Design an enzyme around this catalytic site. Sequence first.
Site, PDB file in Angstrom:
ATOM      1  CB  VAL A  13     -25.263 -25.485 -26.171  1.00 39.50           C
ATOM      2  CG1 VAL A  13     -24.710 -26.119 -27.435  1.00 39.50           C
ATOM      3  CG2 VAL A  13     -24.265 -24.510 -25.557  1.00 39.50           C
ATOM      4  N   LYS A  15     -30.285 -21.058 -23.653  1.00 38.18           N
ATOM      5  CA  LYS A  15     -31.012 -19.773 -23.839  1.00 38.18           C
ATOM      6  C   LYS A  15     -31.917 -19.639 -22.627  1.00 38.18           C
ATOM      7  N   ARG A  17     -32.833 -16.578 -18.982  1.00 39.80           N
ATOM      8  CA  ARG A  17     -32.916 -15.185 -18.475  1.00 39.80           C
ATOM      9  C   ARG A  17     -31.500 -14.596 -18.525  1.00 39.80           C
ATOM     10  CE1 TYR A  18     -27.426 -18.554 -20.730  1.00 40.38           C
ATOM     11  CE2 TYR A  18     -29.216 -19.535 -19.493  1.00 40.38           C
ATOM     12  CZ  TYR A  18     -28.341 -19.575 -20.563  1.00 40.38           C
ATOM     13  OH  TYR A  18     -28.395 -20.592 -21.466  1.00 40.38           O
ATOM     14  N   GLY A  19     -29.235 -14.921 -20.623  1.00 43.21           N
ATOM     15  CA  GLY A  19     -28.787 -14.734 -22.013  1.00 43.21           C
ATOM     16  C   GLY A  19     -28.690 -16.070 -22.730  1.00 43.21           C
ATOM     17  CD  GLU A  20     -29.213 -16.147 -27.452  1.00 38.08           C
ATOM     18  OE1 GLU A  20     -28.278 -16.181 -28.270  1.00 38.08           O
ATOM     19  OE2 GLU A  20     -30.369 -15.786 -27.749  1.00 38.08           O
ATOM     20  CB  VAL A  21     -24.186 -21.114 -23.173  1.00 35.08           C
ATOM     21  CG1 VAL A  21     -22.791 -21.702 -23.352  1.00 35.08           C
ATOM     22  CG2 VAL A  21     -24.331 -20.504 -21.790  1.00 35.08           C
ATOM     23  CE  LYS A  34     -24.233 -16.644 -18.109  1.00 31.15           C
ATOM     24  NZ  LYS A  34     -23.988 -16.835 -16.663  1.00 31.15           N
ATOM     25  CG  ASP A 130     -27.373 -20.176  -9.025  1.00 35.10           C
ATOM     26  OD1 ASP A 130     -28.334 -20.804  -8.469  1.00 35.10           O
ATOM     27  OD2 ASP A 130     -27.409 -19.765 -10.187  1.00 35.10           O
TER      28      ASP A 130
HETATM   29  C1  LIG Z   1     -23.662 -23.498 -16.534  1.00 34.96           C
HETATM   30  O1  LIG Z   1     -22.979 -22.362 -17.081  1.00 34.96           O
HETATM   31  C2  LIG Z   1     -22.206 -22.401 -18.217  1.00 34.96           C
HETATM   32  C3  LIG Z   1     -22.106 -23.526 -19.023  1.00 34.96           C
HETATM   33  C4  LIG Z   1     -21.321 -23.518 -20.159  1.00 34.96           C
HETATM   34  C5  LIG Z   1     -21.241 -24.792 -20.981  1.00 34.96           C
HETATM   35  C6  LIG Z   1     -19.985 -25.322 -21.246  1.00 34.96           C
HETATM   36  N1  LIG Z   1     -19.853 -26.431 -21.979  1.00 34.96           N
HETATM   37  C7  LIG Z   1     -20.923 -27.084 -22.465  1.00 34.96           C
HETATM   38  C8  LIG Z   1     -22.218 -26.610 -22.260  1.00 34.96           C
HETATM   39  C9  LIG Z   1     -23.325 -27.398 -22.862  1.00 34.96           C
HETATM   40  C10 LIG Z   1     -23.198 -27.892 -24.156  1.00 34.96           C
HETATM   41  C11 LIG Z   1     -24.235 -28.625 -24.734  1.00 34.96           C
HETATM   42  C12 LIG Z   1     -25.409 -28.872 -24.029  1.00 34.96           C
HETATM   43  C13 LIG Z   1     -26.494 -29.709 -24.614  1.00 34.96           C
HETATM   44  C14 LIG Z   1     -27.157 -29.197 -25.881  1.00 34.96           C
HETATM   45  C15 LIG Z   1     -28.201 -30.217 -26.393  1.00 34.96           C
HETATM   46  N2  LIG Z   1     -27.675 -31.618 -26.560  1.00 34.96           N
HETATM   47  C16 LIG Z   1     -26.845 -31.815 -27.775  1.00 34.96           C
HETATM   48  C17 LIG Z   1     -26.966 -32.076 -25.338  1.00 34.96           C
HETATM   49  C18 LIG Z   1     -25.874 -31.084 -24.953  1.00 34.96           C
HETATM   50  C19 LIG Z   1     -25.523 -28.418 -22.725  1.00 34.96           C
HETATM   51  C20 LIG Z   1     -24.491 -27.682 -22.145  1.00 34.96           C
HETATM   52  C21 LIG Z   1     -22.390 -25.432 -21.517  1.00 34.96           C
HETATM   53  C22 LIG Z   1     -23.751 -24.837 -21.251  1.00 34.96           C
HETATM   54  C23 LIG Z   1     -20.615 -22.357 -20.485  1.00 34.96           C
HETATM   55  C24 LIG Z   1     -20.735 -21.211 -19.680  1.00 34.96           C
HETATM   56  O2  LIG Z   1     -20.104 -20.014 -19.968  1.00 34.96           O
HETATM   57  C25 LIG Z   1     -19.412 -19.755 -21.182  1.00 34.96           C
HETATM   58  C26 LIG Z   1     -21.552 -21.250 -18.565  1.00 34.96           C
HETATM   59  O3  LIG Z   1     -21.670 -20.175 -17.759  1.00 34.96           O
HETATM   60  C27 LIG Z   1     -20.608 -19.993 -16.804  1.00 34.96           C
END
Ligand SMILES: COc1cc(-c2cncc(-c3ccc(C4CCN(C)CC4)cc3)c2C)cc(OC)c1OC
Lengths: 280, 279
Positions: A13, A15, A17-21, A34, A130
Site C-alpha cells: 500500500v 513504496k 525511499r523509507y521502504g514499503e508498507v 512497514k 515530519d
Molecule cells: C505514514 O506512515 C505509515 C502508514 C501506515 C499505514 C497504515 N494504515 C493504512 C495505510 C494505507 C493503506 C492503504 C492506502 C491506499 C492504497 C491504495 N488505495 C486502495 C487507497 C488506500 C494508503 C495507506 C498506511 C500507509 C503504516 C505505517 O507503519 C506500519 C506507517 O509508518 C509509520
Amino acid sequence: RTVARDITLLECVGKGRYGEVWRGSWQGENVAVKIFSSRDEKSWFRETELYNTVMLRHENILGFIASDMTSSTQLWLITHYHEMGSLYDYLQLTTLDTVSCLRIVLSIASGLAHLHIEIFGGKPAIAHRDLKSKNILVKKNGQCCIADLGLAVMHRVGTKRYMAPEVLDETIQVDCFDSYKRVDIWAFGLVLWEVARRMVSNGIVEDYKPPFYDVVPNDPSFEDMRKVVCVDQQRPNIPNRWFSDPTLTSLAKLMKECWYQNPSARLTALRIKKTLTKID
Amino acid sequence: ARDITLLECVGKGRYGEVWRGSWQGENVAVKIFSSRDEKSWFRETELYNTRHENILGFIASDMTSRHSSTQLWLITHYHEMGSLYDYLQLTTLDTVSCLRIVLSIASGLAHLHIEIFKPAIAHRDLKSKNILVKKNGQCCIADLGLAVMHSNNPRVGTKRYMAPEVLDETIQVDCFDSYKRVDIWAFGLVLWEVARRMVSNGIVEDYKPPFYDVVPNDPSFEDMRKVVCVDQQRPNIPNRWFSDPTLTSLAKLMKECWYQNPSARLTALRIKKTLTKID
Ligand SMILES: COc1cc(-c2cncc(-c3ccc(C4CCN(C)CC4)cc3)c2C)cc(OC)c1OC
Ligand SMILES: COc1cc(-c2cncc(-c3ccc(C4CCN(C)CC4)cc3)c2C)cc(OC)c1OC
Ligand SMILES: COc1cc(-c2cncc(-c3ccc(C4CCN(C)CC4)cc3)c2C)cc(OC)c1OC
Ligand SMILES: COc1cc(-c2cncc(-c3ccc(C4CCN(C)CC4)cc3)c2C)cc(OC)c1OC
C-alpha cells in the site's frame, strides 16, 4: 505456550525511499507492516527507542503493535491498519462539509497536543518533526491519527515542502525543545490549509493541492523552499470564498497564527485545540 | 514459519527469563526481559544489527505491545550444555579441553574488541554465566546488553567481576580503551575459574567464583571495592599449577590481566596469540 509471530503480507500500500508498507494479517486481524530500507534503518531505531521509553496509546496516534528485527538484517514496524489510507490520498478524491472538516482538524490537533505535552506520573514531551498529510491516516469514524515517529524527539531532517523558516535558514534554536514543537505547529498550519481547501461552502471547493504548489516545483530543493518561505516570506493563498464561510474564516485566522516567521509567536497545540472547540 | 513454542524455563532472574523453545523444528533460546532491563534489550538489539563462532548467534529481536503492557524478546541459538559457570560446576578438564575453552573465549573477545572496515565493541559484563559451552567444546560470549561501540550513565556490570577502576569509579568514562581494559580484567577472572578445574598430577580445585574466599556471599559493590581496591587482593594461584607447564603459562597470562594500571593489561589479541602458542 505457542507465540504466533506469523504475519501474512497481503498487498503493498506504499513504496518509497523509507521502504514499503504492507497490509498484513495476524490471527485474522489487519495489521500495517512497514519494511525499512537500509537508507532509513535509523528511523526504525529511533521509533523503537521511543516506544521502548513510552508506550503511546491515543485515538489520534497510529497504534503500535510491534518492532521486529530478523537475521542481512530485516527491520519491520507493525501498527494498526487504516483501510481509508492517508489524509493526502483521501483529500485527492473527497470533499468535506463543516462537520467532517472540523472532525479531521480537531483530531489532528488532539493527536499533536498529546505528542507535545509532558504528562507526569505519564509521558515525555514529543516533537514529531515530519508532520504532513501523508503522515496522517483517516479512520472510519471520521477522526485522523498521526503516523511515523521515525524522526521524533523526546524531552535539516523533515519533508522540505513542510519545513519551517527557521529550519530552512538554520536559525532554529537547536538547544531548545520548544523549537521542535514550533516546527510541528508550522507544518500543522500547512495541513490545515490542505484540508480547509477541500471543505465546500456556497457550492465552491478548491481542488487538492500540496502547500506552495503555485511557487515551487515538484520535489522542491532546499533553496527553492528557503527563497519562498524565508527570503520572500510567502504563505499559502487564502481564497476570497473562505471569507463568506464562518468556519473557513476562523480556520484562516488559525492557520495564519501557525505561520508567523517568529516561532515563539505561533499558537501552541493546546491553544489550537481550545480554539477549534469554540468553532461551531 | 515465524511461529515459536516456549518448551521450558532454563533461567529466571532480575534480567527476566530465558526459555528453551522450538522454531522451524530447531531448538532456540528466548530471553523475555524484565521491565527493569528494557534499555539492555534496546542496546543488545543495536549491537546485533552490526556474526562469529564465539559470539551467541542472533535469530530475532521483538518489542510487542497491546494497551499499557510491552514484551521484549531476544531469540538466539540454543546451547544444550548451558553456561561455562554451569559446565565447570561438575566437569573437570584436561589440558586440551581447558585451552580449547579459554582460546575460544579469547577469540570471541578479540573479535568483539577489533574494528573490521563491524565497529570495535567492549562487552562490559564478561563472566562465566555470560559464556555458553558448545558441543565441539568451544565457547561463545553472550549478553551485549551493556556493550559499547566505537568506530553511558552509571558505571556498573556484575560486582564480583568489576575492574578496580569500576569499583573506585576512577574509570576514564569517555575513553573506549577503558572498556576493553575492563573486559581483560574480567577475562583474567574467567581464566582463573577455568584453570582451577584443569587436572594436573591427579590434582584439581573445586569450582569457586572469583573472590569466594575474601567477600561475603552475594557481595556488595563496597565488598568488592574493599578486597580489590583497598586490600589489593587477586585470586590465589594454587602452588600445584607451577608443576604444570600449561597452568604455569595460564597463571602468567591471568596476572597480566590483573594489573591495577589498566594500560598495563594485555590485549585480547595478545591473549589469543599466547594461548595459540601454548600446548
Ligand atoms: C505514514 O506512515 C505509515 C502508514 C501506515 C499505514 C497504515 N494504515 C493504512 C495505510 C494505507 C493503506 C492503504 C492506502 C491506499 C492504497 C491504495 N488505495 C486502495 C487507497 C488506500 C494508503 C495507506 C498506511 C500507509 C503504516 C505505517 O507503519 C506500519 C506507517 O509508518 C509509520
Ligand atoms: C515475539 O514476536 C511476536 C510475538 C507476538 C505474540 C504472539 N502471541 C502472544 C504474545 C504474548 C504477549 C504477552 C505474553 C505474556 C508475557 C508476560 N506475562 C506477564 C504474561 C503475558 C505472552 C505472549 C506475543 C507477544 C506477536 C508478534 O506480532 C504481532 C510478534 O512479532 C512477530
Ligand atoms: C502485540 O499485539 C497483540 C498481542 C496480543 C496478546 C497475545 N497474547 C497475550 C497477550 C497478553 C496477555 C496478558 C498480558 C498481561 C495481563 C496482565 N498482567 C497479569 C500481565 C500480563 C499481556 C499480554 C496479548 C496482548 C493480542 C493482540 O491482539 C488480539 C495483539 O495485537 C495484534
Ligand atoms: C547469558 O545470556 C543468555 C544465554 C542464553 C542461553 C543460550 N543457550 C542455552 C542457555 C542455557 C540452557 C540451559 C541451561 C541449564 C543449565 C543447568 N540447569 C540446572 C539449568 C539450565 C543453562 C543455560 C542459555 C541461558 C540465551 C540468551 O538470550 C536468548 C542470553 O541472553 C543474551
